[PDB]
Design a protein around this ligand. Structure first.
Ligand SMILES: Nc1ncnc2c1ncn2[C@@H]1O[C@H](COP(=O)(O)OP(=O)(O)OP(O)(O)=S)[C@@H](O)[C@H]1O
Ligand SMILES: Nc1ncnc2c1ncn2[C@@H]1O[C@H](COP(=O)(O)OP(=O)(O)OP(O)(O)=S)[C@@H](O)[C@H]1O
Ligand SMILES: Nc1ncnc2c1ncn2[C@@H]1O[C@H](COP(=O)(O)OP(=O)(O)OP(O)(O)=S)[C@@H](O)[C@H]1O
Ligand SMILES: [Mg+2]
Ligand SMILES: [Mg+2]
Ligand SMILES: [Mg+2]
Lengths: 418, 162, 317, 266, 292, 269
DNA sequence: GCAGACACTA
């Protein structure tokens, strides 16, 4: 027949599943963008799937465009006859650019072009960058919605670089667009339990004749609250509710079981999971849930940096030494699934042993390896410049090791006096 | 042909009766081909057991003069990627008979080195085209094989030579 | 031209499919009603997922499914552009379907399909979900990206119980009219470990190689599964008994050392009786032996040392 | 419906389909008793081009069910059917709708090709009504075709119709963009041109110019010289009311073919 | 030199070898040297076999000095040979001479070219270790399903239109009529839908077409023969029929198809393998739709 | 920054001027090309750093009303522009060879753009094309990117323009190598001399020996890449004769001489 | 998973 989530689409701003603060700070953001001069040229939305990241903007354009429903949604499945997919998005931007007056059609790029090949991924950055610093009168609104979901692991990925690890806004977008002054990044959160419960109440009272036909009117409350608490996606909740209502009965409903985050996994390894009291089943389920993150570098470094926040660094020094020794021994296994299992198991066992002195914890920090690499590159180019300027007037060969160790401080000291 | 080859490739069996040690496997395969049914034979064991010699002798005994055309040999020597399993194997295991209505045998020697996507394509091939073509898989490490492939293939263990 | 029992005796209707009574009843109910939304089917291989999807499509549409659908499986070029174009054309071309019926896009083994194709499928659903519906047949739902699963009702197939597999075996035996022994059937069930296709293959091999199905013939043609042997090895009390079991069950049977190490790791992951410290120590020893095997040393002495160290950490003096 | 054409007018029919297939992947064709109308709506709703074939263009118009039947046929699928094969000619080309688009090709010899593209049937002709809502500039398309054949559209530039004082100064240029610190991320490759003052036929005093795209401006001119029109075949006209906000209208009058194009400016 | 073959008109050799170019990763041609002439056979994945025969009268210096069973083999690459002869025979009145040499066994394939006091010597080492011999996608003429003779120009247009449109799966239809209204067409299914490339039925360019009952002597009218062929096999014969005079079509009940190309003239024989089975029961609707 | 010159049609120098276009396709396919406008008749252009060195001079003395001035202090001025846009002006000018002599080629250097003036007639059509980028480089880069380099000994004098089969043999090497996708050369001092090119592969043994060609130490064996396919295209030079030099077993030059200017190409090991 | 700060009626 017809999907419940399609036939029960919201018609006003009071029916969408969104927080009051989120609605307020997207309404204030979109209102100022419609002005001829706008602080933010484009709007970027990043969040999990089914968080009203597109429908909210849909009714917002419904109730803001007629001030001066005109939505120009990009269709990536367009081909456009004899046109490459790389140039298709370029032509779409210029096609929708000429809508600054009279029409005033908002641009909603929900289905962004696929960026997996080297040529098509690099093109996606400067295409929107060229539209930012263009000195043109007026400005049509442009909203980009990106779903934060990690790409499942694949075979023969060669170097296994970024983007392909997790399809997120931070991975694909570069630094120039992330903190650009004419850009607003409004993050999105999963739908709350209260809003999901209210929407399921509304759907149930709208479908009173269907639910009362079977023996589901008495049982509906438990099912809907379990669905609301189990997942934060409104669309998946509606799909599960429709499946249960269609079902005669005696059927265990299922849920997506969405993957946990990076810091969520870090907290699970260090602090623990209240849902699963058993230690063996928690790690085993987490492995089959996201092996793509555990079988990846910088996770062991994240454990190394955040393990002192269990009691604000007020736990057993012997336990800390054992944990760090176990991670160091795991580092010698060339990054194997067996190596990841042993270190995390040891960390969890130790933190369970010392779990009594864990009333107050601290904040976790993602390791600063990028800064260390950046200073390393800066020191490398500085040393290269020093060797270049020191070899144009005499001879000096000492290899790179002596420059970093001995000439890193003695050489500037001597030139300071001279 | 003889007195010009290493002793390893000088006493290679040519018929099923020339393979010793795995008497149970030979008898079971002989019964399979006497009844006229090949249940996607899979051979597993240490090197030197004689899996490929046994399967080549069996294919020769079944076919005769059709080994050159209807029997396909695959290995790690040639390229075996996603495109190869997508095109060459699909094209070969889609043809009819030429002189005899016997089954089509494809020899996947040292198939444990194939990629996961290639293995998945290969097993979707074996499931779909099983009514006329039966594949044979030879490997030494079962951990490198997709567990879905082992379900669709009759595993035979090659014990060390007594 | 004797067709093998895996293909000759495959089900053609949902009635013959057993193993999950609730799921089969739900499929029959949703076929009778006809309101079939998108779904994802996942589970361990050999339980009857793709055949259930095919049977459901058959007894839901009939001639329409036979003549006017586009079913794609893993044996096609699953590039982004070609799959995008094919599903885009298949979303069109509507016929005089009944009001309670819709087109079904059968997707077999979608775990190996690229992420760009998943995004193209997302766009295709969001643009033409009114005319056609999608069906997913895979092994695990993790390989499917998060946004796809939000638009579908995920159905999970549990492992087949011994009763359903035994009933199917008796039906196939009655169809084939072959003698059987209860001990042989029990051995077949034990070897299958809930795998229907493996059980069918083993029964067919027993019938075609020995005639009467007996426990001795089944044990002769195929030995006990290696996870059970490794599990018994790891739970052995005395080191000498574990060494004898290891030798006489894997070294004399022709089992590779790396496969033994992988099976030991898998058993230790799923073991429950051992403590957390013992489990992590065994995992560390298994990993050390695995890297020793990978670096080149693939002798029995490494396995013996692994067993000795496991016994030492289990006893703890 | 059953329309057959057997003349040299097959080339323009193939040319028009390729033009409409570039704008949109799917071409929606509306049939009516008056004539045949083929058009494609742009993805961004900024380009509206319709090609209308008169009843005299075909030799018969036996159309049976003012009803306006419509169907959506794939542009790429249609543009590879009406093609002219190399080293051969098509004696008779016809398209018909059965009561599965029934299109067949009859070559010079007895060989015939029968194709069955799949379509999807709501006579959305309101866009054509806005096109016929109704300055005046007339310039010869033959001289413009020389500039259009070498415009180098691969850079995807824009066209500024610079009438200036009297003469049409057609330009094909790209606007530069600033980088992090006045950097040229996208190079500006300009290509301007000027037509003689006396060469212009009609002109209106409308100083300050307008900007419109080139890819839709390219394919609309190729249709003219493609068909051998010794008689009539007048040049294209430019019609656009004041201010840059409203779209621009273009028309190419032919004895049997109606050519229209509406492009939204700014 | 144990082998001699002098050729002046290299254009005929250039266009003959150009018919084997559509093979992806072209290599491993089993060239046959015989007193009758030179025959080139190339097989791809053991599903399609093409044989190109060059007569003795084609070469003006054919000697074939040998003291054996007159059956000698050598395996070399196609792309080396294909680009070897196409480069020369330019300008006008160059009378370029091509010399073939092969010292029996174990020696490189020597090619000598002379063009205006400019000499070359190209050697091709052969590959004769695991030559399985025998082979051959041949067929028996006693059970030929039907035979057809068509012009090359008519078939080339059909194949050219069949390729660019796509049509990954193609069908071959053969049907005779008592009123001499024989039906033969190359129809196919693609993403476009149904394509019906109906070949002509008149005797102007369709010389003969009769359908047998599996005995090759008992002609029957009103019976239909349906062949399910892959598109990849059809793409190989597209350029072969580009320059040809008459094309002969012959297939048996076993499903293999033999195509003879005539262009003394040389003969090109192409063998094809039928697909497994008709999709669904399309053999019913092929007869139903075309009859309508 | 006044860089203004006029290019007009003639009889002789057009073949020299039209020879410039062949590299422009290659130069556009390459990274870019540098320029150095000096005085009134000397300018050097080459491809900056494969090993693409194309030191070639053009006699701008015959060119009408050409002047160079810049703020680069010394007489040498660094100049660089993308060669992709240079194809458009040359290709469109090649279509108007039927009629039109007063159209000329007016170029003005203004700052970034170089306006090009056309006066083609079909009633006259005015075309104003602009070169996109003329960006300069560091003054110290001029010394480190000096393109003037030449060697001596082992001079092969090419076959004089009497028989056209010699060029076709080199043009045959252009088409064949593209079709297959190392090159070895021989040199002898025995008098006219003979040229031999040989290719060694696993199974491909190509050797070409010239019996009686009119072209003019020894045993100069050299192994080099396939970059010589460019140099064969420069041999056309229908106005004059071309020179070739190869020695030292590592480097080879192709001295193309036409009118006063000369064109050389450098290949490394 | 957890720390810091806010909404909202019990
Ligand atoms: N009250 C509601 N609030 C929000 N969405 C609703 C509601 N009722 C029904 N829906 C449906 O739930 C879905 C939510 O859509 P969105 O989350 O905005 O799309 P989305 O965020 O782009 O999803 P992805 O990640 O791109 S697949 C839509 O199909 C809505 O029609
Ligand atoms: N049962 C046997 N009886 C006689 N000779 C045997 C037997 N098994 C192996 N051989 C000999 O061992 C040689 C090599 O064994 P193969 O059968 O070619 O390879 P394999 O034993 O299958 O091991 P892999 O998996 O291919 S490395 C054969 O050519 C035979 O000469
Ligand atoms: N419940 C069942 N009753 C009878 N036969 C079954 C049942 N489940 C599976 N089979 C048999 O299993 C074989 C193939 O089943 P499949 O559905 O292909 O396995 P699967 O569970 O889908 O695992 P994959 O992912 O396809 S390898 C056929 O021979 C079926 O007859
Ligand atoms: Mg949405
Ligand atoms: Mg082997
Ligand atoms: Mg399956």
């Amino acid at each position: 027949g017809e999907q419940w989530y399609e036939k029960f689409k919201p018609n006003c701003l009071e029916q969408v599943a969104i927080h009051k603060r989120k609605l307020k700070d997207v309404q204030e953001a979109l209102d100022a963008m419609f002005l001829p001069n706008a602080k933010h040229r484009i709007l970027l939305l990043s969040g999990p799937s089914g968080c009203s990241k597109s429908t909210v903007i849909k009714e917002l354009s419904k109730i803001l465009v007629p001030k001066y429903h005109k939505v120009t949604e990009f269709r990536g499945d367009c081909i456009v006859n004899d046109l490459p997919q790389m140039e298709s998005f370029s032509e779409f931007l210029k096609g929708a650019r000429y809508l600054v007056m009279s029409n005033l059609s908002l641009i909603l790029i929900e289905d962004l072009p696929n960026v997996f090949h080297i040529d098509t991924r690099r093109r996606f950055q400067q295409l929107i960058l060229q539209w930012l610093y263009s000195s043109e009168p007026l400005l049509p609104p442009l909203v980009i919605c990106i779903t934060e979901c990690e790409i499942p692991e694949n075979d023969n990925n060669y170097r296994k670089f970024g983007i392909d690890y997790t399809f997120s806004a931070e991975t694909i977008m570069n630094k120039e667009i992330l903190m650009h002054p004419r850009l607003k990044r409004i993050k999105f959160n999963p739908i709350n339990s209260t809003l999901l419960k209210k929407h399921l109440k509304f759907i149930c009272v709208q479908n009173m004749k269907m639910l009362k036909e079977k023996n589901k009117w008495n049982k509906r409350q438990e099912v809907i609250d379990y669905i609301a608490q189990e997942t934060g996606d409104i669309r998946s909740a509606i799909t599960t509710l429709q499946f249960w209502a269609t079902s005669s009965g005696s059927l265990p409903i299922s849920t997506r079981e969405s993957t946990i985050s990076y810091f969520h996994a870090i907290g699970k390894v260090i602090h623990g999971s209240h849902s699963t009291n058993n230690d063996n089943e928690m790690i085993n389920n987490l492995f089959e849930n996201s092996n793509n993150l555990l079988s990846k570098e910088d996770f062991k470094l994240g454990i190394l940096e955040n393990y002192n926040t269990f009691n604000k660094g007020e736990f057993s020094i012997s336990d800390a030494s054992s944990i760090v020794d176990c991670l160091s021994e795991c580092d010698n296994m060339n990054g194997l699934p067996e190596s990841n299992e042993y270190g995390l198991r040891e960390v969890r066992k130790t933190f369970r042993n010392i779990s009594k002195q864990g009333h107050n914890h601290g904040t976790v920090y993602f390791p600063r390896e990028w800064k260390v690499r950046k200073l390393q590159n800066s020191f490398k180019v500085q040393a290269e410049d020093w060797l270049n300027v020191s070899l144009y007037k005499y001879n000096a060969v000492h290899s790179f090791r002596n420059i970093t160790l001995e000439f890193g401080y003695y050489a500037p000291l001597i030139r300071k006096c001279q | 042909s003889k007195e010009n080859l290493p002793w390893v490739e000088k006493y290679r069996p040519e018929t099923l009766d020339e393979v010793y040690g795995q008497n149970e496997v030979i008898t079971t395969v002989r019964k399979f081909v006497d009844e006229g049914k090949l249940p996607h034979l899979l051979f597993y064991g240490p090197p030197g057991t004689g899996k490929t010699s046994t399967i080549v002798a069996l294919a020769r005994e079944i076919y005769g003069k059709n080994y050159s055309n209807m029997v396909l040999e695959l290995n790690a020597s040639d390229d075996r990627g996603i495109d190869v399993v997508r095109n060459q194997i699909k094209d070969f295991a889609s043809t009819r008979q030429i002189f005899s209505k016997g089954f089509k045998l494809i020899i996947l020697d040292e198939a444990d080195a194939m990629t996961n996507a290639a293995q998945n394509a290969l097993r979707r091939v074996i499931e779909r085209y099983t009514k006329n073509t039966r594949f044979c898989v030879l490997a030494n490490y079962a951990h490198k094989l997709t567990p879905a492939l082992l379900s669709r293939c009759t595993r035979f263990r090659f014990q060390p030579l007594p | 031209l004797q067709l093998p029992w895996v293909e000759k005796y495959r089900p053609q209707v949902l009635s013959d499919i057993v193993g999950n009574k609730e799921t089969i009843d739900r499929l029959q109910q949703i076929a009778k009603d006809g309101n079939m939304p998108h779904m994802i089917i996942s589970g361990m291989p050999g339980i009857g997922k793709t055949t259930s999807v095919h049977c459901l499509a058959h007894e839901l549409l009939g001639r329409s499914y036979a003549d006017g659908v586009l079913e794609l499986n893993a044996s096609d070029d699953r590039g982004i552009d070609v799959v995008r174009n094919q599903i885009k054309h298949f979303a069109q071309k509507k016929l005089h379907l009944p009001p309670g019926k819709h087109k079904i896009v059968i997707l077999d083994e979608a775990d190996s399909m690229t992420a760009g194709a998943q995004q193209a499928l997302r766009r295709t659903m969001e643009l033409y979900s009114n005319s056609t519906r999608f069906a997913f047949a895979c092994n695990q739902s993790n390989k499917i990206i998060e946004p796809l699963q939000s638009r579908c009702a995920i159905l999970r197939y549990s492992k087949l119980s011994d009763e359903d597999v035994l009933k199917r075996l008796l039906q196939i035996i009655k169809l084939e009219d072959v003698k059987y022994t209860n001990d042989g059937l029990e051995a077949i069930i034990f070897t299958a470990e809930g795998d229907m296709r493996q059980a069918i293959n083993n029964l067919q091999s027993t019938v075609a190689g020995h005639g009467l199905v007996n426990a001795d013939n089944v044990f002769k043609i195929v030995d006990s599964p290696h996870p059970l042997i490794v599990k018994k090895m790891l739970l052995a009390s005395n080191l000498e008994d574990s060494i004898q079991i290891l030798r006489t069950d894997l070294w004399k049977k022709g089992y590779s050392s790396i496969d033994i190490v992988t099976t030991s790791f898998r058993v230790t992951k799923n073991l429950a009786q051992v403590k957390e410290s013992v489990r992590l120590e065994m995992i560390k020893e298994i990993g050390l032996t695995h890297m020793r095997i990978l670096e080149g040393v693939g002798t029995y002495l490494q396995l013996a040392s692994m067993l000795a160290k496991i016994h030492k950490l289990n006893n703890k003096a | 419906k059953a329309t057959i054409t057997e003349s040299g007018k097959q080339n323009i029919w193939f040319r028009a389909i390729y033009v409409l297939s570039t704008i949109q992947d799917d071409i929606k064709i509306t049939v009516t008793t008056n004539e045949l109308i083929a058009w494609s709506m742009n993805e961004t709703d900024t380009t509206l081009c319709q090609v209308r074939f008169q009843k005299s263009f075909f030799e018969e118009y036996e159309f049976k069910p003012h009803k306006l039947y419509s169907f959506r046929v794939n542009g790429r699928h249609l543009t590879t059917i009406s093609r002219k094969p190399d080293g051969d000619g098509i004696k008779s080309f016809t398209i018909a709708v059965n009561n599965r688009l029934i299109v067949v090709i009859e070559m010079d010899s007895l060989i015939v090709k029968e194709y069955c593209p799949q379509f999807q049937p709501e006579r959305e002709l309101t866009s054509a009504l806005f096109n016929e809502e109704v300055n005046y500039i007339c310039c010869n398309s033959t001289l413009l075709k020389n500039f259009l054949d070498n415009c180098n559209v691969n850079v995807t530039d824009e066209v500024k119709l610079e009438i200036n004082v009297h003469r049409l100064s057609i330009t094909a240029f790209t606007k530069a963009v600033y980088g992090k610190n006045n950097d040229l991320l996208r190079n500006a490759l300009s290509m301007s041109n000027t037509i003689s003052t006396l060469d212009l036929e009609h002109y209106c005093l409308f100083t300050k110019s307008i900007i419109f795209k080139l890819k839709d401006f390219k394919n609309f001119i190729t249709i003219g010289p493609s068909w051998k029109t010794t008689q009539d075949g007048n040049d294209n006209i430019s019609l656009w009311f004041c201010h840059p906000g409203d779209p621009i209208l273009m028309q190419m009058q032919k004895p049997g073919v109606k050519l229209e194009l509406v492009e939204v400016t700014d | 030199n144990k082998f001699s073959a002098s050729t002046v008109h290299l254009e005929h050799i250039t266009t003959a070898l150009s018919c084997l170019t559509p093979f992806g990763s072209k290599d491993d041609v089993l060239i046959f040297i015989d007193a009758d002439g030179l025959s080139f056979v190339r097989e791809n994945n053991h599903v399609i076999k093409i044989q190109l025969l060059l007569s003795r009268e084609l070469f003006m210096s054919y000697s074939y000095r040998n003291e054996t069973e007159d059956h000698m083999k050598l395996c070399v690459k196609i792309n080396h040979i294909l680009d070897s002869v196409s480069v020369m025979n330019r300008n006008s009145d160059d009378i370029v001479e091509c010399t073939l040499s092969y010292d029996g066994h174990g020696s490189p394939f020597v090619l000598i070219f002379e063009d205006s006091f400019i000499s070359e010597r190209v050697e091709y080492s052969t590959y004769l270790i695991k030559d399985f011999d025998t082979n051959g996608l041949e067929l028996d003429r006693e059970r030929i399903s039907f035979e057809a003779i068509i012009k090359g120009e008519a078939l080339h247009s059909a194949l050219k239109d069949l390729k660019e449109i796509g049509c990954k799966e193609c069908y071959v239809y053969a049907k005779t009529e008592a009123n001499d209204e024989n039906v033969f067409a190359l129809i196919s299914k693609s993403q476009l839908g149904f394509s019906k490339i109906k070949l002509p039925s008149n005797r102007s360019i369709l010389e003969k077409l009769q359908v047998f009952d599996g005995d090759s002597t008992t002609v029957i009218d009103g019976f239909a023969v349906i062949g399910f062929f892959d598109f990849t096999s059809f793409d190989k014969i597209r350029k072969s029929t580009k320059i040809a005079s008459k094309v002969l079509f012959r297939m048996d009940v076993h499903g293999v198809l033999s195509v003879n190309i005539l262009s003394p003239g040389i003969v090109i024989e192409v063998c094809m393998l039928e697909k497994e089975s008709i999709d669904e029961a399309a053999q019913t609707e092929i007869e139903l739709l075309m009859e309508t | 920054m006044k860089l203004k010159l006029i290019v007009n049609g003639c009889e002789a120098p057009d073949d020299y001027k039209l020879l410039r276009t062949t590299i422009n396709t290659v130069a556009s396919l390459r990274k870019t090309a540098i320029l150095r406008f000096n005085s009134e008749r000397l300018t050097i252009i080459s491809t900056p750093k494969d090993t693409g060195q194309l030191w070639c001079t053009i006699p701008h003395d015959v060119f009408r009303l050409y002047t160079v001035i810049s703020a680069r202090e010394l007489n040498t001025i660094t100049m660089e522009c993308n060669c992709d846009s240079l194809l458009s002006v040359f290709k469109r000018y090649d279509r108007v060879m039927n009629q039109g002599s007063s159209s000329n080629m007016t170029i003005k250097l203004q700052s970034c753009a170089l306006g090009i003036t056309f006066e083609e007639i079909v009633k006259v059509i005015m075309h104003s094309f602009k070169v996109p980028v003329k960006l300069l480089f560091r003054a110290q880069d001029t010394r480190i990117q000096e393109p003037m380099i030449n060697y001596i000994q082992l001079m092969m004098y090419k076959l004089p323009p009497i028989s056209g089969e010699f060029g076709s043999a080199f043009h045959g090497f252009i088409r064949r190598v593209e079709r297959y996708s190392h090159i070895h050369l021989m040199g002898v001092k025995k008098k006219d001399v003979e040229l031999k090119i040989i290719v060694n592969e696993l199974d491909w043994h190509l050797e070409i020996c010239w019996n009686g060609p009119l072209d003019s130490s020894t045993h100069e064996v050299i192994i080099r890449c396939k970059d010589w396919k460019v140099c064969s295209k420069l041999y056309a030079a229908f106005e004059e004769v071309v020179l070739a030099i190869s020695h030292d077993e590592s480097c080879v030059f192709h001295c193309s001489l036409d009118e006063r200017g000369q064109i050389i190409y450098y290949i490394a090991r």
